[PDB]
Structure formats: structure tokens, C-alpha cells
RNA sequence: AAACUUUCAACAACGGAUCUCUUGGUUCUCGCAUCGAUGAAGAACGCAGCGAAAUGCGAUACGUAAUGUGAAUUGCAGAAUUCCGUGAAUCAUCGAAUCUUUGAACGCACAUUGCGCCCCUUGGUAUUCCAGGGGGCAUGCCUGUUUGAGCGUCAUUU
RNA sequence: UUGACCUCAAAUCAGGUAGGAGUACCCGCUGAACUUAAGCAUAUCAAUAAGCGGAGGAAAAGAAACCAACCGGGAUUGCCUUAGUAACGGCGAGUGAAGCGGCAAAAGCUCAAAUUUGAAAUCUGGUACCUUCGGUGCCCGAGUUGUAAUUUGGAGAGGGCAACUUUGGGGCCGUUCCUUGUCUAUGUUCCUUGGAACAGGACGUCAUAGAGGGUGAGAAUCCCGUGUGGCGAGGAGUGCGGUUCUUUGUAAAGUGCCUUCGAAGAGUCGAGUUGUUUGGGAAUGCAGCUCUAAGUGGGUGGUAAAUUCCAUCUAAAGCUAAAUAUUGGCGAGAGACCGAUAGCGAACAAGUACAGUGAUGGAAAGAUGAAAAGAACUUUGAAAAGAGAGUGAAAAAGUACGUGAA
RNA sequence: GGUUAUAUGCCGCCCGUCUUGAAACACGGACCAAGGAGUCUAACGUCUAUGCGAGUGUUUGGGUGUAAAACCCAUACGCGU
RNA sequence: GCGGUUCUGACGUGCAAAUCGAUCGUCGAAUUUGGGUAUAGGGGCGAAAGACUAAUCGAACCAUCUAGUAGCUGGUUCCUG
RNA sequence: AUCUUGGUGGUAGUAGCAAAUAUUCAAAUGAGAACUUUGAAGACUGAAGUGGGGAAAGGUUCCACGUCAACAGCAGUUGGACGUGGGUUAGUCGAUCCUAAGAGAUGGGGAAGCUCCGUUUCAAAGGCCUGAUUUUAUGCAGGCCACCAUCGAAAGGGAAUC
């Protein structure tokens, strides 16, 4: 149960925040867990996703398969993987759309703003 | 890529009116090549270079002139502060602040006391 | 007098309102010299005002001003309270001498009606008041 | 409109009432405002009491000049005999009212008493430092009953 | 008419510019729910009333 | 206040072979000529529009509300009436069921789960969580999705930790013994609440 | 007997009820006090690689600067992937600017993209004409400055 | 002749200021009729709608020319009461306040009228400089037809005597208040169904967190949040808690006794009359016109008048937080509310499209699927399309898209 | 035996409405969906239930709170005596 | 050109919310007419018909007061006892 | 409830699609031709025209290329349709200037006020000429006259093209 008088339990002021949440925003609302190996490296439970970051998808039709985030459409709220793909009946192939939630980090992009963010949850980093 | 505006406060008012000319013309050329092509996106980028440009020879020239009146009663009004009509027009902290030599005594003999109930 | 001002003398109505002679502005002529100095000269405020002479035609009035900008004015703390925005257009409100006399704001019995404001002093007397638990 | 034997009703509602009707919700949030703001109040003003020190006095009319009741401040001559001077007495919490007239020695000495008492269960604190805790007491109503 | 203020032929040329069926692409966006162009006139159909 | 009157609508009156009710002027759309206004009218005015000084809340008289809490109290130690109002109190051993004062100053959830599992509150804890269920209705768009049973109310003299302590507990209220609420004891107006109280609060009823 | 008409069922139509949904409404409560001659509200016309709107903006025109975030945007095209960075973005924030033509609207006008005057400057043989660039010219009222008017009036001196 | 003064002008003179918008609430002015009276005129609707002027975060009111008649209360406002009462009223219909009492909030004060007269002690502006919401010099000016100090009726002033008490203004650092940022638990373990597990079953874990939302179906434990607590940044403001610099004091204020005094607002008050208004009745307030005061006076004391008392305030000049209002603006939180013919006119490129010369009038219109995977390819056809094939959990979901009634 | 369609015997005017009197040569109704009309409030009468009872009424307000809830309460005031 | 007599012709769910055909009045002025301009609702304008004042006239149009009042017409939604 | 909104019937493949004299043959095009294009013929408006230009008004309808789902009450390969583009050149033609009936600021006076009156008035109501001075394009030198803003004609007045 909430306490605060700042904070709103109304489902359509929730779901209107949802779906208009600006680029920045979306950012932290598409975050992935970390998988078990990771997290021992890390000390870190979850970490907003980002292109080139390697995956794995643990839920739905596509549950096994591996690849790099190749396009976080945030638009879509939405990652596309290089390798989970359709292929179309005209013989194309597009890209399905995951969502984070259901994917679990295996290879982080590091770089100074990534590391920095890791110690600033209270990671390792090692 | 585009120039960057911290680039652009190191030079001078000579160079940046220089430059200034170089992207007018430049992007008179892309206006024609536009014609021949289907799409053209680089004009974009020189489009918002040019609005750099301007925009940091106008910082220049108004911090020059801020310089100008510094400490002088008057300047210009689009160097005072905006605020809003009715704040502009407010007493200031000096004028609202002013008692009358009368009150002034009775403010000193007659302060309202610290004190507790027990 | 006041003439009301209809066409022809025509009211359109009820014989209590045929009245076109004999009727009263309900503010005084003191407060109409007022007003229409306040209007000429709106970069001043209207402190007060006095009665110099009468003919039969007109009455005559002088009618003291204050500049609010002036500094003389804003740096004295006994008059630098006309300064403050509420006092703008203080004759337009009602708010001189004259004006509170044609309010009829005043203390005691013979002023029940008008002395906390007629319109408020009504809104209130014609208000029905629910609480919760009735 | 009249038939049966019924009581005749005075119910006023042939202006536009209906425009100005005034329901109380905000009660249960107009009493969580008001201790809101006597808790600030308090906190700005602290150590003081949210409350000046009020005389008592007789309620007029035959109807209840058998009770007494809180006034609205000493006489000035209430506080003359009490060892105070109006301006002082203002500042150290004690409402002065300059209309009241004594003509009634019970009442007289009764506020006198009452502001004797209350300089004995005050300290002022002195105007520059050594500060001493006090402690908020909120109510002279209270310990003054 | 013919003779015309430049008022009137600046109002008539914004017209012109809007007189035009809804650009393809726009249908293929996210979320788009546009069809076609609500707001087409024609000089058959509605005046302008200058 | 203003819906289904900002129309400038007349009646056309007779002789036009419609009714009489009033409608929209003026040309060129849909709406001109419809009608307008009446409760019957696609776009008019509700009938007898509702009013925000309707009763809402209702005065009763306090010593009845006193009377009702009495009788709420009293049934919750009677176990026929607990058994009835849907509470698992079949194993427990003796109602009303007092358990020691430490009750008040556990601390944590997970302390205060296994006191009252210990107690014989298990099977009452259960059924709260088993009892979850999407509301039927357009409540649900209305911030009351979810639909659950009552637990125990636990009631306490003086808290040093059990109110937070069961918060998070679904189904279990707390009480200061001072204040019993009829809300909680009777609730649904069905007498026989589950109660369990700190001895504490138990000596203080008298 | 068929056709036809009528009734019922199945499948197909017509039409958009019903059911379920809901980034909208409505009402109550709480907190706050901030428009404008430093040109507001409102209007017109414009501005994107590809837009007619809605939304944003003003020839610096779906934005410039600043600050934060830390890699997108996405319909396609294009660009970029030193992206371990003074740094992506239809991102957030926003203190610096830009802000056409207008509008209380202020040189005069306005069913006109009509007609002036003043200062500085550039070009054309130019104080005077024509053109370009910059900056100005409303009314009422107040304080003050300066220049004045009146046998209203004082002194002094003809 | 020269120089003032008074009054009045001019300037693209130096510096300012007003206008328009919004308009829920607020201060005024002006002002209906429908309606009720079973007709209708006074009355009522209403001191309302419409019209006009003027403000603010509140406005207005406000420290008694008050209430009373008591053992007296003591600025204003608001609530509960007083009370559907006293009173008004074709005494019909109808209308209708106040005092006291309980409460919320509480806060008090300023001018005019006085000889600084051994010293216009005062103030705008310009100018230079400075530590610039301002300060200091200097110079013009304003001002004696009166700018400061002193006093405001509660008093107070001038003399005289006697005594003790109490003080200013800076920075700097915390707290406060607002605006912001960031960090802070626990399963994606197994089985069944399914396109998808967020379903069922099993075994756990966290809980000051089982609010809410998202994610391919009902998710505390997958994600964002929530709960608890921590750490930053940016202001505002001395509100007040500490520290430091300067000590204003020959100054300022308070206090007792004696003595002499005690200035207190005019075409106002009041009166007549006219109109309007009020519960206000031989006249409640307001306004016009005529008349027009006093100073042991003046006002009020709800029945006109004369006479005699008494009681109570101190008008005709002024400022002031809070408690109160709020269908507007900005920011939040909610609901036994409505669920696309409902709810705002408007869930959508809605005050839009469209109508009207104009004022104005003013709609309809939400839902494929988890994902476009939006039907490659073949074949008939001039083509639209058909038939196949295919995608999909389903085309008995094909954009003429959920369900699909009559 | 039920249901249903049909046949046969006998019987059976078109509903709604105003009206002394409607199948009426009285009025509304071509059809279908969805919407569509005794409500809320102030003050009251009779009756009934409930609490307390010569009293009674906590909710203006204050206290408190797990916060528009629940719980607690002085002085008045209302009606009654 | 301006008008609009008769056919009481066509048409009379029209070509048309005033038209069509024939017949007819007038045809150099109290003539016809474009544009500009003035007059605005108890108001205008009228060689006068209560005519005309944007298909509106014995008092225009728009919004609001206003859900105006109606002793009058129409309707008023489930079952059984 | 001549109820409200929306939808749908019978009527009915029915009334009807008959004013303005009128069409015909061949070829081309095309899936398709009573209706498009060309040619041939036959007719009509008959210069107070069914011709050639403009004013008001419209606003791209003009022209080309592509092109037929809808619209052109039959048709359609055609179009004032649909899609995409192109196109309007002035010292001399207009506007702009002038005044007309009129409209309308200011000075003033009314009006509670929105505003009303009035248009040269019961106002201290301006702005040219010339030389210079060679200081500078303002004060100075002189002079001079003083009526009263402004708007109001794409047919009136009016600088200039064939
Ligand atoms: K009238
Ligand atoms: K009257
Ligand atoms: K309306
Ligand atoms: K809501
Ligand atoms: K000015
Ligand atoms: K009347
Ligand atoms: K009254
Ligand atoms: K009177
Ligand atoms: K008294
Ligand atoms: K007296
Ligand atoms: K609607
Ligand atoms: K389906
Ligand atoms: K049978
Ligand atoms: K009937
Ligand atoms: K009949
Ligand atoms: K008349
Ligand atoms: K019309
Ligand atoms: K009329
Ligand atoms: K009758
Ligand atoms: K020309
Ligand atoms: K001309
Ligand atoms: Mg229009
Ligand atoms: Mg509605
Ligand atoms: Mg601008
Ligand atoms: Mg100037
Ligand atoms: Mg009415
Ligand atoms: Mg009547
Ligand atoms: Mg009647
Ligand atoms: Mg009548
Ligand atoms: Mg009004
Ligand atoms: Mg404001
Ligand atoms: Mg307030
Ligand atoms: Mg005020
Ligand atoms: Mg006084
Ligand atoms: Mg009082
Ligand atoms: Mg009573
Ligand atoms: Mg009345
Ligand atoms: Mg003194
Ligand atoms: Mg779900
Ligand atoms: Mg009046
Ligand atoms: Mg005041
Ligand atoms: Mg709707
Ligand atoms: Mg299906
Ligand atoms: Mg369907
Ligand atoms: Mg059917
Ligand atoms: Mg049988
Ligand atoms: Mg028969
Ligand atoms: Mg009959
Ligand atoms: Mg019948
Ligand atoms: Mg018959
Ligand atoms: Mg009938
Ligand atoms: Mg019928
Ligand atoms: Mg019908
Ligand atoms: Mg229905
Ligand atoms: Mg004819
Ligand atoms: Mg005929
Ligand atoms: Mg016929
Ligand atoms: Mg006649
Ligand atoms: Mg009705
Ligand atoms: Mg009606
Ligand atoms: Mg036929
Ligand atoms: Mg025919
Ligand atoms: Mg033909
Ligand atoms: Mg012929
Ligand atoms: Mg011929
Ligand atoms: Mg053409
Ligand atoms: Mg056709
Ligand atoms: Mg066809
Ligand atoms: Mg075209
Ligand atoms: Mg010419
Ligand atoms: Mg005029
Ligand atoms: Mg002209
Ligand atoms: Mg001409």
C-alpha cells in the first residue's frame, strides 16, 4: 500500500504515463534483468537495455535464442534482435519485436557512463 | 556534422562574420544542387550551422553592450530584466522596507519578546 | 437628477418603473468628479477630494492626487501604502470618502443592510448552508 | 395548493436558489487545514503559546450576566495595578483592550490576580542570548482556566 | 476579379498549397490513424467565403 | 449544470408534421433540426439531473452506534457466529482468543505471519489469499479491481510495531482496543469477525 | 403440379445492437498566485529531405544557445556507430537569444501589402533628386529641463 | 533697461506611467421581463439576468460618532445559533433582519488641528565615485500658500522636581521553506493446458514493499514503481539556531510626583422635500434640490412632538495579516459517478467539417491481430476481382477488419 | 405423453386513448434497434421501527486517526419539561 | 428595355419554394438601370397594399433571461394476490 | 408520446429520365464506342449571336501529361472529374493621386459609462521660400503666408505607347 500524497494508484492516470512517456523516459521503463551470471559479476539485479548489449529471450516462441540488441525502438516500447527474425512468405525478413522484460543480459556495452552507472547502483564492475 | 558553439566563442567578430558568409553561400549551392537530386538532407545541417553562427556574434555583440552600461543607472530595456509587469512595478525590497522615524522607536522599545508558558 | 435614458420616455414594462424625471444617481456628484479626474489622469491615484463652489448648473470640486511613481512617494512610509496595486482606481471602487459614504459603510443598527457590503451582506442571507451530517 | 389539515410552511425558495447552495464537504479538510496551520503557527512562534492571555469578564443582558466569560483584554487600569504597562504588556503576551472600563471591584480584582499569576508562570527570555529550553506549553486558555 | 487585392491573392495561394490528397507515407507511421485528408475543398463543392 | 442546454434549440410548434419537441436551427450538419433538450432527446438533458446536495453521509444517534459496537464485540466471542461469517476457525481452541501483549512489539512481517499461524490464524490467512478475484463490472475501470475475503483483526492497547508489522498482511486488520471500529467488526453488516486480542488489550475492555 | 405468397430453420446478406474494453468526461478535496507598451490574449502568412492537418516554431522558422541524461531517431531516405563522448535524441530541463505581418497597437493610412517625415550611413557628379542598409516620429498624465507668452504683476532703470 | 514673481504654454526635451486580455470568486454603477398572486395594477420574481466601470490572490470590512440598559460588553470577517422570529405586506401572495450566547481567527494603528524659529532640521533630479533593490559627496531644483522631528484622544503637550531601567547594524555557517536529482527487497525453479503462462498444480523467497502500471491471458517475487531510509544540486528567506565583524550612547525609549494646558476634520452634521431602497413601521440606507449648525458641543438610544434627566460613543481625514469566497488559471489527489445515442458540444487533425451577408449556429466519427506475419507464387479475367496456394491460435479476424442482434 | 406445423368443428373485430358510449366513417401507430417520463432538496403531517427517557440531540467546533472513515468531547444552542 | 392583363393555358412530388407559352400594358420620361452613399426594429422606408425592411413582417434576425406559465392535448416502462 | 437518434421496408424495377427543330456514314482509338478523335455529309445560332471582350462574383476552373473507383440522374476510352506538374513579366493599362454624396479623429461640450455630438468650430492648432554660412545642412541672416486631420470612385477628374 502506497503512503505518500505525491503518488497515484489511478489506473488511467498510470496507463496515460505509460503511453505517452517521453524518449528519455521509456529509456528507464525498458529496462532487462541481468542474467545469474552476471549478477555475480556485477552486483546489479537490472539495467536499463541498449543497442549491442547480448541477450537472451527467456519467454514466448523465441525462448533460447541468443543475439545483440540490434534496435531499441522506443517508440514500440520495444528491442529488435539481430537473428530473431520472420521470414516472409516474398522471401524478406523482418525483425520481431521483444520486450525487455522477457530477455535476460548476457554481455554488457561497457563504456565510462555505463560503468559509472553500475557503480552508482553499487556494483563491482571488477 | 555541423559547427559547435563552443568552437565558435573562441573566435573573433571578424572570423565568425567570415564563416558567417562561407555557409550563406554554401547553402545557396545546395538550394540549386536540391533541384537536380530527389532528397538532399545535408542542407538541414547547414541550415542550424548558420543559426549558431548568428547566435553566438548576437551573444558577443549584447555582452559588449552589458559591459558597456555596467553599473550605470539606465540601460536598455531589452538588457533589464523581464520579471513581469506587475513585479516590475512593485516597490523595491529599500522603498517597502521604510518605517517612519516614529514606528523606528517603537519597533526598538516595544519588540514582541521571546517567552513561556511554565 | 439623473433623466433615464430610453428612448421617448418609453419603459416597456410595469407602471413602478414608468419613471423617467424624478429619478437619482445613487452615487453623489462629489464621486462623478472623482471618476472622470481618475480617468484623465490614470498614472495618479485619487486620495480625496472637496467641494470649492456651486452655480445652478454645476458644482465644482478640486480633487487631490498622488503620483505612485514618483520617488518622493514610494520612499515615504507614511504614503508609499497608495503604491501597492490594490489601490489602483480606488474612486472607480468605491473606496474615497464619498465612495464609502454611498456604500453605506458605517457601524451599527441603521446600517445593517450595507455595512459589511450590500451584495455580500445579501449573497450571505440568501445562502443555504448544508453540511454533512444535516 | 391548501387541502388537509396540515401545519401552513414558510419555505423560501422563490429567488434562484439553487445558485447558491453551499455544501460543507471540505469539513473533514477545512479541520486537517486549520491544525495544519495552528502546528505551523506553533512551530513559527515557538517557544510561545498560540494564544494571548484574555480577561474575564461579566456577560451582559439579564439573560447571562450570571456567568463569566473570556473577554477581550485587560483594562488599562488592570494592568497599571498589576505592575505593566500596556505597550510592554502586548509584547509579552497579554491582550490590552483600551475600551473596557472597570466599574465593578469583583471583576477589577479578579484580572488582577489573573495577570499576576500569569507573570509568575512566564519567563521572557532576555533579548540577545543564553537562550534557555523552555518548552511549547500551546495553550494560556488552558492554564489559565 | 481579375483586379484583385494582394490580400485576396495571398488568402487564395495558401489554397492552393493545401489542395492536395494525403501524402502516402503518412499511413505507414506508428499509430497513425489518419485515412485521408478531412479538410480537401474543391471550387465545385464549397466556397470560401473569401 | 449545463449539460443538454447549450443549444439555442425552439420548438417549431404545429403544422411542420413533427413533434413538438424543441430543435437545433440554423443549416448545413447533421445536427440542424434534431431534437434537443427533452430527456428523451439523443443529446438532451438527463431527467432530474443529479445534484451534489443529495445526502451523503447519515447521522446516528451515538449511543445507538455505541449499542451496535457492543453487539458486534460480544458476537465476535461467540463461535457459531464466527463459523458462519466465513471464518476458518474450525481447530482453533478456545474464541475469543487472547494471546500475549508481545504481539505489540513484533517488529517485522515475517515475525508477525508466523504469531498469528502459530495462534491457529493459518487456515483465516489461506483463504485471503486464495479468495482473489478481478471484480465483476465496470468497477474494475473504476480503481477496484480485485475482490477478497476478510482475515482476522487483530486488536492491540498500545502499538509498538504490530500495525506495521501486518500492513502488508492481505486481509489482516489491527485495532487499538480504544477505538473498535463497526466497519471491522461487523463487516458487511454480518456479525461474528474474527478476532484475536493481546491481553492487554483484553484487560481493557472493562 | 410449378410459379407466387406466407411461416420456421441452416448458410449467406443488409445493418451496427449487444457483450467486453477505455490515454475521455464528470463531480469532490488539497495546494498555489504568475498576463500586457520590456508589445499580451487573439489574428494572418510562412517554415521540414519527402506534410494536407493536429502539434511545434518565426527568414536563426517542427527550431538556435545553455543545462541534465548518456545513444538514439524510425514511415522511408539519409547520416552516424572515436558512441570509454564537451556527446545521439520529434529526449528532459530551460536562466541566453531569435521572434515575419499584425493586434491595446503607437508616423499617417488600411476593402491599399497605400503615402510620409527625421538622424546616421553607402552608391549614383548630390545639402536639395533617386536607391540600398541601420535607427527613429502616437495619445493622456506626472516630476524635472529648456525655450517662451500675458500692462496678471513687483522691483529697477529710461 | 535689466532681473524677478504669478499664471499659462511648447519640445521626437530627461525619466516614467495608463490603456488591452482574463474575469470562478471580489468592489461599485445601471437594471428588466417571463414568473407568483389561480385575473391584475402595488407587491413578487430581484435590490436577480443582461449592460457598464474597477481590483487581488484573495477582495471588501476593520480598530466604534458600535452594542447595550447588564453585575454590562468591546475592531472587522466567517460558522453554529438567534429565526422563518421582531418587523414589512392589495396585512393578500409573499417577504424578513439584529443584539446577546458557543466557536474559528485574532493585531493593531496613522494624519489634520502646535513656533525648528538659536538656525527647512525635509525631499525629487543631475553629476562623479562606490561595497549598486542602494550609499556618499557636489550642483540645480521643490518647499515657508509649510517639507522634517514632536502628539492622535486609549491620550497627550509645555514647564518644574526625583529616580532608576532597556537598546543598533552587518557578513559567514546550520535548520526552515520551496524546486529538483540519485541510490536503496525477494523465483523468471519444475509439471499440465495454451500461439503466448501472467492460468492450474508443486516447491520456495521478500514484506515498514500484496498501491498502481507494463510485459503475447488473473504477475508482491520478469520490468518500472511501491515501502523504508540514505546521499546530492539549485534557489528563496533571516522566519530562528549558532558563530564572527562593527557598539549605536553627548543618542533613543519607558517610568513616578507637582503644575499649566489639552488645538480634535462644514455646503459638513442636521432639517425639509422628491425619488429609490430596507424587516426598519409619523420615514433603514442612498442620492438630487432647498435650508444650513454647534462647542459643557455633536451623534445614537427602532412611535411623531415639547419639557426634564440619564446612558453611550466622538462623525464629516487615513492604513492594516488571519479566520471567509472561488463553475477561471497552474499543480496534485480522489469517487457506491458515465462508459462511445452515455459522459463536456468534442475519448478521434472539435469549437473541427459544414451552414449563414452577419451576430451566430455547429455535427458525425473509438476497438484486425500477440505480431503485419496486410496474402509470395499459380491460374481465369481488359480490369475490379475470382479460384487456388499461403500467413495466423483463428481469415466463422482480410484493413468494406473484435463480437456481430433486429 | 410433450413440443411443433398442418387439417377439421365451433368460437375469435385493432391495439393504445379521451369518452355516458370505440371495431368505428374519432385521434397516434409502416417496420426494427437503442434512448425515453413521480426525481432530488428545505421544511412538514399521520403511521411504523430503533436508541435513550424528564429529558434528548457526539459531527458549528475541539481532540485523535491506520486520515474525507472510525473513535473521543467541553460550553452553549434547539426542541421538550 | 421595363412591366405582368387574360387564357382563370402549361406545370402544380415542377426546369422553378413563383417558372414556361401565348396573349397583353408601357416604351423619351413622375423612364430604366450599375456602382458609391444615407436611413435599423415600436425603429426605418412607404405615389399607402399594413406594403417592404436578405424565401422572415398587423413589429426582422441572433443569443440570453428560459427547462418562461398552461385549470388545456398527448404519453407515462415488470408479475401475481 | 404527429416521441429522440440510427437503420430498413412495401410502394417499385414503378412515377419517370418528352421545353430550347437533328442527326447520319466511315475510319481511328480502345476489353468495350448512339455519346471520344479525325474525315465526310445534313442542320442550327443568324452580328439585340449559341460570335469576340470585359465589370461584379468565383479562385486555378486556364494549359499539359497520366488517367476512370466515385461524379457528369443513359454511357464514357471523354471532362469544368481524379493524380501530377506548368502557367499571370508594365515608367506609359489599372490601383496608387483628387474630390462627390458621405464617413471621421483632434479642440471642446455631453454621458454613471460602453461612448455621443460636431468637422472649423468660444484652440496660443503651422510650413514654406531666398541668400548663405562656407563653421552646418540645424540654429543664424532675412522675408512670406496662415486656410484646419484623414478616409471616400478599378464607370467621375487624371502625366506618358504604338
Ligand atoms: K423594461
Ligand atoms: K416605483
Ligand atoms: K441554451
Ligand atoms: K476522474
Ligand atoms: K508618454
Ligand atoms: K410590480
Ligand atoms: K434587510
Ligand atoms: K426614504
Ligand atoms: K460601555
Ligand atoms: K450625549
Ligand atoms: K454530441
Ligand atoms: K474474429
Ligand atoms: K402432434
Ligand atoms: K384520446
Ligand atoms: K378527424
Ligand atoms: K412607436
Ligand atoms: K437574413
Ligand atoms: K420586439
Ligand atoms: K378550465
Ligand atoms: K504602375
Ligand atoms: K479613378
Ligand atoms: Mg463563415
Ligand atoms: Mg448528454
Ligand atoms: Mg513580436
Ligand atoms: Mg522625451
Ligand atoms: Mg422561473
Ligand atoms: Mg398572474
Ligand atoms: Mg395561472
Ligand atoms: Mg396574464
Ligand atoms: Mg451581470
Ligand atoms: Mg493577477
Ligand atoms: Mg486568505
Ligand atoms: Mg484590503
Ligand atoms: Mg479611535
Ligand atoms: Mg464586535
Ligand atoms: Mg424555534
Ligand atoms: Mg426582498
Ligand atoms: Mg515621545
Ligand atoms: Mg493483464
Ligand atoms: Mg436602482
Ligand atoms: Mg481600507
Ligand atoms: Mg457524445
Ligand atoms: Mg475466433
Ligand atoms: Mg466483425
Ligand atoms: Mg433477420
Ligand atoms: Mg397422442
Ligand atoms: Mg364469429
Ligand atoms: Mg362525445
Ligand atoms: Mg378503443
Ligand atoms: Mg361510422
Ligand atoms: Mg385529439
Ligand atoms: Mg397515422
Ligand atoms: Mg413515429
Ligand atoms: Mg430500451
Ligand atoms: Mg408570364
Ligand atoms: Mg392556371
Ligand atoms: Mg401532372
Ligand atoms: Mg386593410
Ligand atoms: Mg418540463
Ligand atoms: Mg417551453
Ligand atoms: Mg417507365
Ligand atoms: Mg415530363
Ligand atoms: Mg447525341
Ligand atoms: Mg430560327
Ligand atoms: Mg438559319
Ligand atoms: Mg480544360
Ligand atoms: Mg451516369
Ligand atoms: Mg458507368
Ligand atoms: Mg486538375
Ligand atoms: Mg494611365
Ligand atoms: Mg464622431
Ligand atoms: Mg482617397
Ligand atoms: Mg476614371
Same mark, same amino acid.
Given at each position: 500500500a502506497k503512503q505518500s500524497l505525491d503518488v497515484s494508484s489511478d489506473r488511467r492516470k498510470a496507463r496515460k504515463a505509460y503511453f505517452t512517456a517521453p524518449s528519455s523516459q521509456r529509456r528507464v521503463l525498458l529496462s532487462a534483468p541481468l542474467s545469474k551470471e552476471l549478477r555475480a559479476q556485477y552486483g546489479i539485479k537490472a539495467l536499463p537495455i541498449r543497442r549491442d548489449d547480448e541477450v537472451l529471450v527467456v %519467454? &514466448?516462441?523465441?525462448? &533460447?535464442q541468443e543475439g545483440k540488441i540490434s534496435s531499441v525502438y522506443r517508440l514500440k516500447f520495444a528491442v529488435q534482435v539481430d537473428k530473431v527474425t520472420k521470414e516472409k512468405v516474398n522471401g524478406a525478413s523482418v525483425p520481431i519485436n521483444l520486450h525487455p522484460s522477457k530477455l535476460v543480459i548476457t554481455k554488457l556495452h561497457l563504456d565510462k557512463d555505463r560503468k559509472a552507472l553500475i557503480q552508482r547502483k553499487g556494483g563491482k564492475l571488477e | 556534422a555541423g559547427v559547435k558553439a563552443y568552437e565558435l566563442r573562441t573566435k573573433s567578430k571578424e572570423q565568425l562574420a567570415s564563416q558567417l558568409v562561407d555557409l550563406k553561400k554554401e547553402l545557396a549551392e545546395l538550394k540549386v544542387q536540391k533541384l537536380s537530386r530527389p532528397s538532399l538532407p545535408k542542407i538541414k545541417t547547414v541550415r542550424k550551422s548558420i543559426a549558431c553562427v548568428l547566435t553566438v556574434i548576437n551573444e558577443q555583440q549584447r555582452e559588449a553592450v552589458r559591459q558597456l552600461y555596467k553599473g550605470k543607472k539606465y540601460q536598455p530595456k531589452d538588457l533589464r *530584466?523581464?520579471? =513581469?509587469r506587475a513585479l516590475r512595478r512593485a516597490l523595491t525590497k529599500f522603498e517597502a522596507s521604510q518605517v517612519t522615524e516614529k514606528q523606528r522607536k517603537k519597533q526598538i522599545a516595544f519588540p514582541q519578546r521571546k517567552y513561556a508558558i511554565k | 437628477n439623473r433623466k433615464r435614458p430610453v428612448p421617448k420616455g418609453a =419603459?416597456? &414594462?410595469? !407602471? +413602478? /418603473?414608468? &419613471?423617467?424625471?424624478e429619478l437619482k444617481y445613487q452615487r453623489s456628484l462629489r464621486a462623478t468628479a472623482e471618476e472622470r479626474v481618475g480617468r484623465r489622469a490614470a498614472n495618479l491615484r485619487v486620495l480625496n477630494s472637496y467641494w470649492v463652489n456651486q452655480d445652478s448648473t454645476y458644482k465644482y470640486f478640486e480633487v487631490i492626487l498622488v503620483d505612485p511613481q514618483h520617488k518622493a512617494i514610494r520612499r515615504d512610509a507614511r504614503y508609499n501604502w497608495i503604491c501597492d496595486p490594490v489601490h489602483k482606481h480606488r474612486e472607480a471602487r468605491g473606496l474615497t470618502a464619498t465612495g464609502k459614504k454611498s456604500r453605506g459603510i458605517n457601524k451599527g443598527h441603521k446600517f445593517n443592510n450595507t455595512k459589511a457590503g450590500r451584495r455580500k451582506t445579501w449573497k450571505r442571507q440568501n445562502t443555504l448552508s448544508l453540511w454533512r451530517y444535516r | 395548493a391548501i387541502s388537509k389539515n396540515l401545519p401552513i410552511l414558510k419555505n423560501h425558495f422563490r429567488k434562484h436558489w439553487q445558485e447558491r447552495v453551499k455544501v460543507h464537504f471540505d469539513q473533514a479538510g477545512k479541520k486537517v487545514s486549520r491544525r495544519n496551520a495552528r502546528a505551523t503557527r506553533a512551530a513559527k512562534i *515557538?517557544? %510561545? !503559546?498560540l494564544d494571548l492571555l484574555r480577561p474575564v469578564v461579566r456577560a451582559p443582558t439579564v439573560k447571562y450576566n450570571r456567568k463569566v466569560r473570556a473577554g477581550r483584554g485587560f483594562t488599562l487600569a488592570e494592568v497599571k495595578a498589576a505592575g505593566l504597562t500596556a505597550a510592554y504588556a502586548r509584547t509579552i503576551g497579554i491582550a490590552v483592550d483600551h475600551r473596557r472600563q472597570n466599574r465593578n471591584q469583583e471583576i477589577f480584582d479578579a484580572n488582577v490576580q489573573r495577570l499576576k499569576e500569569y507573570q509568575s508562570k512566564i519567563i521572557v527570555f532576555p533579548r540577545n542570548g543564553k537562550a534557555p529550553e523552555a518548552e511549547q506549553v500551546l495553550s494560556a486558555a488552558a492554564t489559565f482556566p | 476579379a481579375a483586379q484583385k487585392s494582394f490580400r485576396i491573392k495571398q488568402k487564395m495561394a495558401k489554397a492552393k498549397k493545401q489542395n492536395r490528397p494525403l501524402p502516402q507515407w503518412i499511413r505507414l507511421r506508428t499509430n497513425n490513424t489518419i485515412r485521408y485528408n478531412a479538410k480537401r475543398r474543391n471550387w465545385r463543392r464549397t466556397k470560401m467565403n473569401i | 449544470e449545463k449539460a443538454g442546454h447549450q443549444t439555442s434549440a425552439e420548438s417549431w410548434g404545429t403544422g411542420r408534421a413533427v413533434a413538438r419537441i424543441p430543435r437545433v436551427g440554423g443549416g448545413g450538419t447533421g445536427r440542424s433540426g434534431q431534437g434537443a433538450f427533452g430527456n428523451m432527446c439523443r443529446g438532451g438533458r438527463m431527467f432530474a439531473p443529479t445534484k +451534489?446536495? %443529495?445526502?451523503?453521509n447519515v447521522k446516528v444517534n451515538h449511543n445507538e452506534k455505541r449499542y451496535a459496537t457492543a453487539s458486534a464485540i460480544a458476537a465476535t466471542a461467540v463461535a457459531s457466529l464466527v463459523l458462519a461469517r466465513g471464518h476458518r476457525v474450525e481447530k482453533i481452541p478456545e474464541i475469543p482468543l487472547v494471546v500475549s501483549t508481545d504481539l505489540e512489539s513484533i517488529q517485522k512481517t515475517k515475525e508477525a505471519v508466523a504469531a498469528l499461524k502459530a495462534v491457529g490464524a493459518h487456515s483465516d490467512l489461506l483463504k485471503v489469499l486464495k479468495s482473489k478475484k478481478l471484480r465483476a463490472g465496470k468497477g474494475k475501470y473504476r480503481n477496484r479491481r480485485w475482490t477478497q475475503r476478510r482475515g482476522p483483526l487483530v486488536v492491540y492497547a498500545e502499538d509498538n510495531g504490530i500495525v506495521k508489522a501486518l500492513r /502488508?498482511? !492481505?486481509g489482516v486488520e489491527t485495532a487499538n482496543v480504544a477505538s473498535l471500529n463497526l466497519l471491522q467488526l461487523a463487516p458487511g453488516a454480518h456479525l461474528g469477525r474474527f478476532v484475536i486480542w493481546t491481553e492487554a488489550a483484553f484487560t481493557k475492555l472493562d
Open positions: %519467454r &514466448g516462441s523465441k525462448k &533460447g | *530584466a523581464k520579471k =513581469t | =419603459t416597456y &414594462g410595469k !407602471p +413602478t /418603473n414608468q &419613471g423617467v424625471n | *515557538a517557544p %510561545r !503559546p | - | +451534489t446536495w %443529495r445526502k451523503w /502488508n498482511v !492481505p
